[PDB]
Amino acid sequence: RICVDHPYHGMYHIWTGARVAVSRQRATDKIAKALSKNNKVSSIWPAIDQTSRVYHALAMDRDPTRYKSGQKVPIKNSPVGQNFLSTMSNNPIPPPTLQIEVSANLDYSHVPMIHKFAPEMAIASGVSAPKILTAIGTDGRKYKQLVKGGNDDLRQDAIMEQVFAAVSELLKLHRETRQRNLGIRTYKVLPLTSSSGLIEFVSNTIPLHEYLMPAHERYYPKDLKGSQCRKEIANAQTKNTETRIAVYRRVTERFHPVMRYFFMEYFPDPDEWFQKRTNYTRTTAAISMLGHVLGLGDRHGHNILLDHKTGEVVHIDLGVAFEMGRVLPVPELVPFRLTRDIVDGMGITKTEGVFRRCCEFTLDALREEAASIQTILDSLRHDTLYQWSISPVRMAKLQNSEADRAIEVVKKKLSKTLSVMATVNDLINQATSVSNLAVLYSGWAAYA
Amino acid sequence: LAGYALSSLADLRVFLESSQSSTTQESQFKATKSKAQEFHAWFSKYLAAYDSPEFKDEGQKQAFRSITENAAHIRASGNAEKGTHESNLLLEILKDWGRENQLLNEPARDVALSMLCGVFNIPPSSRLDVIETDEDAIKNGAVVWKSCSSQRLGGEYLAWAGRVLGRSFAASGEVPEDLLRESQLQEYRRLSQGVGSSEEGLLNLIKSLTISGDCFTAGLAEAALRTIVSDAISDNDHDLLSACQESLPEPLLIASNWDPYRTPLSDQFKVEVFSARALENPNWSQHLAIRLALSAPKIVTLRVLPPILSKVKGFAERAFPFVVHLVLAYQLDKQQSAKRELSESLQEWLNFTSEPAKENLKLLINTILYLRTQPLPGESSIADRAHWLDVNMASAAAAATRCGMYKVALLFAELAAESTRSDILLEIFENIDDPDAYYGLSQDASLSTVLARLEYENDGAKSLAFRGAQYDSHLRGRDLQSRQDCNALIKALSSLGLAGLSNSLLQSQQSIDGSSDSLDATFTTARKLEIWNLPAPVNSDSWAVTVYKAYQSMYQAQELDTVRSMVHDGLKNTVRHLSSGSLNTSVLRQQLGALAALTELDDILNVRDQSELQCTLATFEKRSKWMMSGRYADV
Amino acid sequence: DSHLRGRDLQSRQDCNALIKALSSLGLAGLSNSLLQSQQSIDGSSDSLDATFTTARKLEIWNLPAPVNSDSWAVTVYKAYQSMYQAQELDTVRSMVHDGLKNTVRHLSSGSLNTSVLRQQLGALAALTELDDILNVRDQSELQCTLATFEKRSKWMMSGRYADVSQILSCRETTLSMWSQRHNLRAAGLTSADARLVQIRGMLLSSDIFRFHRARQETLNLSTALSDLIPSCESLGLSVDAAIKMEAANALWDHGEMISSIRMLQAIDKDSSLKKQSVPLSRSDLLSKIGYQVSVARLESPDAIQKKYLEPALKELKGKIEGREAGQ
Ligand SMILES: Nc1ncnc2c1ncn2[C@@H]1O[C@H](COP(=O)(O)OP(=O)(O)OP(O)(O)=S)[C@@H](O)[C@H]1O
Numbered sequence A: 001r002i003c004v005d006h007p008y009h010g011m012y013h014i015w016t017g018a019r020v021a022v023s024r025q026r027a028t029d030k031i032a033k034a035l036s037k038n039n040k041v042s043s044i045w046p047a048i049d050q051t052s053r054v055y056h057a058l059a060m061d062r063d064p065t066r067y068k069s070g071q072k073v074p075i076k077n078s079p080v081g082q083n084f085l086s087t088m089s090n091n092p093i094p095p096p097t098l099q100i101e102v103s104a105n106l107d108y109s110h111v112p113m114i115h116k117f118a119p120e121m122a123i124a125s126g127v128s129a130p131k132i133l134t135a136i137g138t139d140g141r142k143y144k145q146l147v148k149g150g151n152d153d154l155r156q157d158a159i160m161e162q163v164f165a166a167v168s169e170l171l172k173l174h175r176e177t178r179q180r181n182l183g184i185r186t187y188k189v190l191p192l193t194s195s196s197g198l199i200e201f202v203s204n205t206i207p208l209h210e211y212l213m214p215a216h217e218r219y220y221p222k223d224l225k226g227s228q229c230r231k232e233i234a235n236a237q238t239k240n241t242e243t244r245i246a247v248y249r250r251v252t253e254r255f256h257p258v259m260r261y262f263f264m265e266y267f268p269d270p271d272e273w274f275q276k277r278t279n280y281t282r283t284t285a286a287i288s289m290l291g292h293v294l295g296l297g298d299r300h301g302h303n304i305l306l307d308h309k310t311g312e313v314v315h316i317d318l319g320v321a322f323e324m325g326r327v328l329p330v331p332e333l334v335p336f337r338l339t340r341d342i343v344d345g346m347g348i349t350k351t352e353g354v355f356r357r358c359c360e361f362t363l364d365a366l367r368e369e370a371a372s373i374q375t376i377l378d379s380l381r382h383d384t385l386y387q388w389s390i391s392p393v394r395m396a397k398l399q400n401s402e403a404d405r406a407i408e409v410v411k412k413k414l415s416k417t418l419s420v421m422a423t424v425n426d427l428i429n430q431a432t433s434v435s436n437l438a439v440l441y442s443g444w445a446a447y448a
Numbered sequence B: 001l002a003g004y005a006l007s008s009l010a011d012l013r014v015f016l017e018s019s020q021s022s023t024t025q026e027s028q029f030k031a032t033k034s035k036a037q038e039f040h041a042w043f044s045k046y047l048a049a050y051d052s053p054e055f056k057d058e059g060q061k062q063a064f065r066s067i068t069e070n071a072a073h074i075r076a077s078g079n080a081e082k083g084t085h086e087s088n089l090l091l092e093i094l095k096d097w098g099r100e101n102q103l104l105n106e107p108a109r110d111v112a113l114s115m116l117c118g119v120f121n122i123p124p125s126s127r128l129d130v131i132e133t134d135e136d137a138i139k140n141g142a143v144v145w146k147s148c149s150s151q152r153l154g155g156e157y158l159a160w161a162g163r164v165l166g167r168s169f170a171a172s173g174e175v176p177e178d179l180l181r182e183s184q185l186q187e188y189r190r191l192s193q194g195v196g197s198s199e200e201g202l203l204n205l206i207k208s209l210t211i212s213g214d215c216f217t218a219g220l221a222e223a224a225l226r227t228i229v230s231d232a233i234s235d236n237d238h239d240l241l242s243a244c245q246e247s248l249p250e251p252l253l254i255a256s257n258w259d260p261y262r263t264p265l266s267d268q269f270k271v272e273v274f275s276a277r278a279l280e281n282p283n284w285s286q287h288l289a290i291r292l293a294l295s296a297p298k299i300v301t302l303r304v305l306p307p308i309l310s311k312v313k314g315f316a317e318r319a320f321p322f323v324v325h326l327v328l329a330y331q332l333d334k335q336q337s338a339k340r341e342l343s344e345s346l347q348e349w350l351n352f353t354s355e356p357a358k359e360n361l362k363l364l365i366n367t368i369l370y371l372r373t374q375p376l377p378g379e380s381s382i383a384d385r386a387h388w389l390d391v392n393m394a395s396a397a398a399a400a401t402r403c404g405m406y407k408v409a410l411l412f413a414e415l416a417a418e419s420t421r422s423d424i425l426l427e428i429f430e431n432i433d434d435p436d437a438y439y440g441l442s443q444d445a446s447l448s449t450v451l452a453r454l455e456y457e458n459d460g461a462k463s464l465a466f467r468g469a470q471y472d473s474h475l476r477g478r479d480l481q482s483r484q485d486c487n488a489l490i491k492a493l494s495s496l497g498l499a500g501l502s503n504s505l506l507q508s509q510q511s512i513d514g515s516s517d518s519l520d521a522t523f524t525t526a527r528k529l530e531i532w533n534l535p536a537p538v539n540s541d542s543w544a545v546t547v548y549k550a551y552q553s554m555y556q557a558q559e560l561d562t563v564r565s566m567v568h569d570g571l572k573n574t575v576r577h578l579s580s581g582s583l584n585t586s587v588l589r590q591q592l593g594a595l596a597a598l599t600e601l602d603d604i605l606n607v608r609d610q611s612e613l614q615c616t617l618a619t620f621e622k623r624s625k626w627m628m629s630g631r632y633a634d635v
Numbered sequence C: 001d002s003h004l005r006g007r008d009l010q011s012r013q014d015c016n017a018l019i020k021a022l023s024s025l026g027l028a029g030l031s032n033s034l035l036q037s038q039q040s041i042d043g044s045s046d047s048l049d050a051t052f053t054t055a056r057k058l059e060i061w062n063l064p065a066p067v068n069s070d071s072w073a074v075t076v077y078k079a080y081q082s083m084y085q086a087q088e089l090d091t092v093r094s095m096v097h098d099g100l101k102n103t104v105r106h107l108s109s110g111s112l113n114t115s116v117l118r119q120q121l122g123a124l125a126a127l128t129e130l131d132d133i134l135n136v137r138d139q140s141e142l143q144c145t146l147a148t149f150e151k152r153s154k155w156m157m158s159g160r161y162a163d164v165s166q167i168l169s170c171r172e173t174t175l176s177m178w179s180q181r182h183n184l185r186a187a188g189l190t191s192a193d194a195r196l197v198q199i200r201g202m203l204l205s206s207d208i209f210r211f212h213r214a215r216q217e218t219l220n221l222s223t224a225l226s227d228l229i230p231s232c233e234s235l236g237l238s239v240d241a242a243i244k245m246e247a248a249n250a251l252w253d254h255g256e257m258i259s260s261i262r263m264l265q266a267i268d269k270d271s272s273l274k275k276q277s278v279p280l281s282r283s284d285l286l287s288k289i290g291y292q293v294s295v296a297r298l299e300s301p302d303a304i305q306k307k308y309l310e311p312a313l314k315e316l317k318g319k320i321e322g323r324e325a326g327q
């Protein structure tokens, strides 16, 4: 009944389930067969069927010659590309990465369908080339998409995105966090199979590392390069903590932060500049507290996007949660990312100010909703497919009862024993400490 | 044709109604009046029959029809009733004003508004008003505020604009963004559009004089454009050509070209300020702009300016940044004279506390801001745009703090701190509009500083404790600060709701000389305790006095007309005070809340039966929906 | 408010109650302003006592005090007033003795419930302490009076709160008046001595009020102490460190942790804790900062030990006995 009333919310789950695992597959197949038989959803299920088939085919198709990392290839030269374009022309659906709100009136006609595709598609660097499609919709907007193929697990990322969205929705019920619009920015992950998915390409952002590495040499031409700092920190990775900390101090004495310019060069108007810098500080505070409480890890520069229209950061790739990050070979022993550049984007008042007061309001509203957070994680506990440990596949892809332990740690981070002021002071002390930042992995660019 | 029809029809109508013939043959007059009436009838027929393929949409065509048809039948004055012609025309002008492809230009709209809003007629009730719902008010509040920023507007029009702004704020709790901006960078970016150069900015400024001038001014502007465009065509300057092709429409781009002739000697007619104490005469900008523009004769756009900078009024303030940038960019590789002179004078101009020099200091700060957005030639980063001039950013921060531009002051203070690597940061932080920014400033600790933070925070009993301690210790030691203490206490006790205690603290004090904090505190308490016999000062900038006078008049009156007159006087005065200019955000939001209170008063005074009572109650409920999350002072 | 607005007649009673409340907090200025406004002063005997407690606290020595009144506040007020308007100790002693005599006659009168009884006994105690400091002749008796105040503190820490607050407020008035009135003092008692004794008595009362968790009284005391520093620097006294530490304690007890920590660190940075009266050891200050920084998590537990605890153990200078080293 859910898939019949709200098809764009249940039919992709049914498709993924069809196309104790054998019994689940059989039951989902029976539901799919029944879906392609009734009158309400009969021009919608075949569309999603054929479209998902061609999206998956396009995802799995990797050719090192036909797809060169960094190029921009017109999607008409591979047979997969032409079959994809034709099938998408014959079957109109809403863009699979568009976030559709649930309709109480059960009317999904106001949803933009895919009108056409832009002729070309970009390519990113990797082995299984992730391709960035663009789709021009009926209402004339551009929906970009990452068609991600390979051996990744996007169901982790999708589940955690849903959990983070639910907790941020809890934040709206309290006066202090609602007055400041404290919350997180969401994106849409859609796993097609156990090896492919569609990720929403966030509209007008730029990765934090891709701004910071050119800016560091544009504003300080006498400093070290980003690559020289990374290599110098990675060479002293098998040495005693004293030498690692000495090398880290030596590197960061020749590397100065430049983040404060991101706002002086995208927003030259002082009114707009002030508002956007405040948006950045508030969204950083909210996601720092929310990712401490849920153990969120893997917070390097390529998982943080800077929205250069509203100023506010977006965190993607949220799958390494519940402290799975301090189990890695070179553990991530910081509660959140607060390096010198994240803190430089905040101005004269480095921390004391908007960032600390917003950390305290967030953490104070979170430990007054510990029952609802317990309910959300409990619903997570009855999910047979969610893995509570990081499988050595991804653990090798990252650095070159488990439910009960995780939920207990989350439950003791929300304990009212210490005051909020003292808790936040301790967190900001251990997130900015040089002895903690010096022993982090070199791909986690802490010098930056 | 839309603007010309509106202007011409309005003028004709006014001329038709006016009838004063003393040195005109009383029959000659009837002759010309009949001639005018028939021209009006013919023009109205032509406009009703007009239909163009060049209309952007059908919305523009319906707007054209409505504007022309209503203008053809307006009276001598304007009103705000529902269904008349003057009100439909006013609503069309306003609705068009806020758009992207608008028909009327500024002169035509100004003519029509000055004809309608010069003598206005505000409806008694609000069920007969042309804007009566909270939604129409939220939609039209920005434009109605843009409208009542003139000086040819009657009192009843300001009362109507007050009612609309008050209904919009009572329904949304949001300030129109026209009141929140503090720099002029949005104007400079609206002018210099398309390419984003100073040449396009000056060309738009000059082109706007052809349509909005008197014979002399339009003549000066057409002459300047003729010389500019002809010299750009002959010398094949591609930068200036690309500026003209995007600043001027094609008919004016063709009528500016001396193609088969030569530029006549009647057009090209030619006509200390680099020191302190010069910032105080109201013609500093004009003299300095002329002085600068004369120093660069090779730029054709600056050569034709002195004949416009000296004659046209208010043109030098609008064109100052573009002129400064053009000169500085011209002499970049040559000997940099204007840079040296301006950067030596700024050391004296920025440290200038004065009332007559504030309005030129604002222009200097806006010029610095504008130069910060123009790319240096041969630069690696935006950190080299600090070489246009040589500004001492601490002095500029202090200066921007004196002028009431606090976000600009904060930007300058940050640039200064970058130049280095806290007495001005306190004044910035106290007044900037952010709840948490103030707590980022570090200062030496004591009970007094904690009290200062608690009074900024508007805490209740917590500041009452520290203030009571200070006040006792100062009464006991016969210290003179106790007066100030008493003042603070009054403030605290009026932020809690304890009105009796603050009343008793008020009568005791006998030197009531507490800038304006005591003025407002003496009438909030009187209104809360319902003491309706205070003699309220006249012409006061305080919202509490305005609201108090309205309620007092409601107490001492036997007819609704006196109360309505007092409410309308309150709305009018509040709008004039909002237009006065230099108000920081708290005073601004207080004035808007006064408008909202007067509007709710006027709403319940005009109920006639039970159904309107219930509709008023339902309105209160929807506004509660907005209030639950809004700012606390306003609520 | 609701009775002033509706022109109700109960507001008078309300005002009366308010006065009482505001005199049980320590806010004397607010109750004074509430007093003058009221013009029908017919409030059985609650207003009679409230009209003279406030006058004594604010030091308004020109009220015409009724004669033959059963109120302790009037008795104590007349004693202190006569101490203000007198040039010889004999007049003051005569007024104190008249006060003791009248108080005893009133205690003998019979029908008094327990609160009035304990108020009268506290009036006797206040007059006795007044008579004790009026009769000091040299420094040794001054120090013996101070030691007496300390032993009585031992009893006070656990006693009833009304009795303690009454005795301690009257003792504050006594010490301040004695410090002001130079002609009542003996020969060899300079003004620096009277000032120093006043300060020590105030710091003692601040300890006593801190255990009872009376926030407003520690606030009043620390403010009135901070106001004495300008007049103490001109007499040749160095009492800035102890008074600023009392202010820091008031802050910490109202919840301002960071302000208290910053204030103590400022005391430690720029202050000469050696050459100053009302001594203050550097090791107890350092350990106080260390405790407060640990409670507020303001620094990492590796810098707390390096900046505050090991410097404290080093400031002990090999002394391994006493309460300072124990702390
Ligand atoms: N959903 C998304 N929306 C917008 N940008 C994205 C999104 N996902 C990734 N990106 C960015 O686009 C690029 C794609 O990154 P990928 O190559 O897919 O993964 P990656 O994170 O770069 O690889 P590693 O393992 O972190 S080195 C990166 O520069 C990301 O910052």
Ligand SMILES: [Mg+2]
Pocket (backbone or CB within 6 Å): A302, A303, A317
């Ligand atoms: Mg990634």
